[PDB]
Amino acid sequence: IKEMPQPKTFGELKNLPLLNTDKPVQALMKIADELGEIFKFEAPGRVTCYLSSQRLIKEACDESRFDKNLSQALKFVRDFAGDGLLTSWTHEKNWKKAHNILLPSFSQQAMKGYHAMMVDIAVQLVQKWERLNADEHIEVPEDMTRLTLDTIGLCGFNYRFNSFYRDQPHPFITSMVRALDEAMNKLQRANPDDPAYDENKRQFQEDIKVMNDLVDKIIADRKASGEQSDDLLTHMLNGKDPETGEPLDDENIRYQIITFLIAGHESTSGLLSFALYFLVKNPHVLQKAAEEAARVLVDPVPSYKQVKQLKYVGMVLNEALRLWPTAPAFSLYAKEDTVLGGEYPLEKGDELMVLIPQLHRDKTIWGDDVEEFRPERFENPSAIPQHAFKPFGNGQRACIGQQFALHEATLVLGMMLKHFDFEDHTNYELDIKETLLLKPEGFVVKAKSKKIPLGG
Ligand code: HEM
Ligand SMILES: NCCc1c[nH]c2ccc(O)cc12
């Protein structure tokens, strides 16, 4: 039974002067470097416990002792994501209901049914790049986000945002991204009720309405038509929860659709963008991955089967997730009083944060070379100890989109690697922007086409 390590407190400010930054996860990694696998962090009227080792995070992932906490960020996102899967407590009625109803639509097997829709948007990405003039370049996370938004729109509810046809995004996207940005800015806002933010508030409401109006209309149309698709909206209209018997009502179906776009677009765009960043910075890895792409993707359009074959591409992506997990933290609370790690008493309701990039640098698991990009770490992946690698969160509250994201990212990265040679034409210096997720801000490349045609 030990005192918890804690950085220096400054009277009533407590630790807050140490987290004055636009990059707080990177700043908390620097505090973990100094203080170790666990530290308390206090700010006026907030207290939490940052964990960075596999030893402690395994205990935090014990669902009989700890459950998912809604961070202040998630509570602000709940203003438009409602009680959809990401922003609901495990004890809310719609959390288990939607979980039960949606799980089979997110399984590995379900990816067979999404694959042609994913190929549609992936082809649009490849074609856009094939069509660039020789002096142009690619804005990587910008184009990965066009691809992931459009892919979730098509697989989610058979709706085309047509992001590759546009300089300014579809108004739903504009509103979603502006609402997310307002949710995030509220975390930093001294006087949220000051008349200065009256206009923020009005715009937020207007953004919510834009979002609700389109999705409520899509759901209403689909109910009145009676049409059946290979989409999530179909499965939610049909499904019943085996436990309660209850269906999702129309309002919750809307929150789930807003949720899949919010939860899937920026995370999967980040994973693709960091994986390309690492490949252009590690030429021998990029060559190995490109050889696998050419060896495996032998047809003009990839099949579901071929995508499962891209084992090295899968390792590249996991290794990008190891170094910069795009959803870099998740929040837990103690279900009852408990002692963490034999050393640290916690009280019921105490909050723990899992610092994922720091966990993924735990040298007692991964060895000393934790900064090196080496996808071969994952050559044999049942060998990684349980709870050492957690880029999709934990247990029943883990990422429902995991198979979707990884099938998406492997298909797209395999196609990119099949069709282009890539140039880091600016000698780009990694700069990690943190919103509610991580992104390689300003990452740009040039793609020289291999002139390999696409099928129809
Ligand atoms: C590489 C891309 C992704 C990563 C790294 C990621 C990561 C995560 C993590 C870390 C959580 C747990 C959050 C928490 O504990 O507070 C989560 C939850 C969730 N994610 Fe993802 N995700 C990704 C892609 C997606 C996609 C594409 C979708 C939807 C199609 C999605 C949908 C969800 C949903 C609905 C939850 C809430 C699950 C539940 O609590 O029942 N995610 N994700
Ligand atoms: N599905 C992971 C993306 C994700 C996980 N948690 C989140 C919180 C806020 C947000 O915008 C996005 C996310």
Cα–Cα dist 191/231, whole Å: 43
Cα–Cα dist 214/153, whole Å: 12
From the CA of 267, how far away is ligand 2's center (Å)? 7
Per the listing, tokens 């990008």 go with 320
Cα–Cα dist 370/359, whole Å: 10
- The CA distances from residue 343 to 39, 50, 237, 388, in Å, are 13, 15, 49, 21
Cα–Cα dist 17/10, whole Å: 8
Cα–Cα dist 25/50, whole Å: 10
Cα–Cα dist 69/351, whole Å: 7
Q: Which of 154, 255, 399 to mutate to test the pocket of ligand 1 (most atoms within 8 A of CB)?
A: 399
Dihedral Cα 171, 176, 181, 187, nearest 10 deg:
150
Cα–Cα dist 296/279, whole Å: 19
**Contact (CB, 8 A) for 442 and 30:** no
Query: Which two three-digit tokens encode residue 239?
Result: 């499904």
Query: Which two three-digit tokens encode residue 326?
Result: 């795009």
Beta strands per DSSP E along 44-191: 46-51, 66-68, 138-139
**Which residue's CA lies nearest to atom 18 of ligand 1?**
399
From the CA of 326, how far away is ligand 2's center (Å)? 9
State whether the beta carbon of 278 lies less than 6 angstroms from ligand 1: no
Strand arrangement of the beta sheet that strand 138-139 belongs to: 138-139, 444-449, 420-423
Closest among 286, 309, 296, 314 to 420, alpha carbons compared: 286
Residues belonging to the chain = 456
Query: Which two three-digit tokens encode residue 214?
Result: 């389109």
Strand pairing partners for 41?
Answer: 48
The domain total for the chain is 1
In 10 A of CB 99, how many CB atoms?
A: 17
- CB-defined site of ligand 2, < 6 Å: 73-74, 77, 86, 180, 262-263, 266-267, 327, 399, 401, 436-437
Cα–Cα dist 297/280, whole Å: 21
In 10 A of CB 401, how many CB atoms?
A: 21
**Contact (CB, 8 A) for 17 and 10:** yes
**Which residue's CA lies nearest to atom 43 of ligand 1?**
399
Closest among 343, 344, 397, 340 to 71, alpha carbons compared: 397
Per the listing, tokens 């990452």 go with 443
Q: Which domain holds residue 295?
A: 1-456
**Contact (CB, 8 A) for 357 and 29:** yes
**Contact (CB, 8 A) for 47 and 16:** no
- The CA distances from residue 393 to 57, 330, 331, 351, 389, in Å, are 11, 7, 10, 16, 9
Atom of ligand 2 nearest to the CA of 71: 8
CATH number where 135 lies = 1.10.630.10
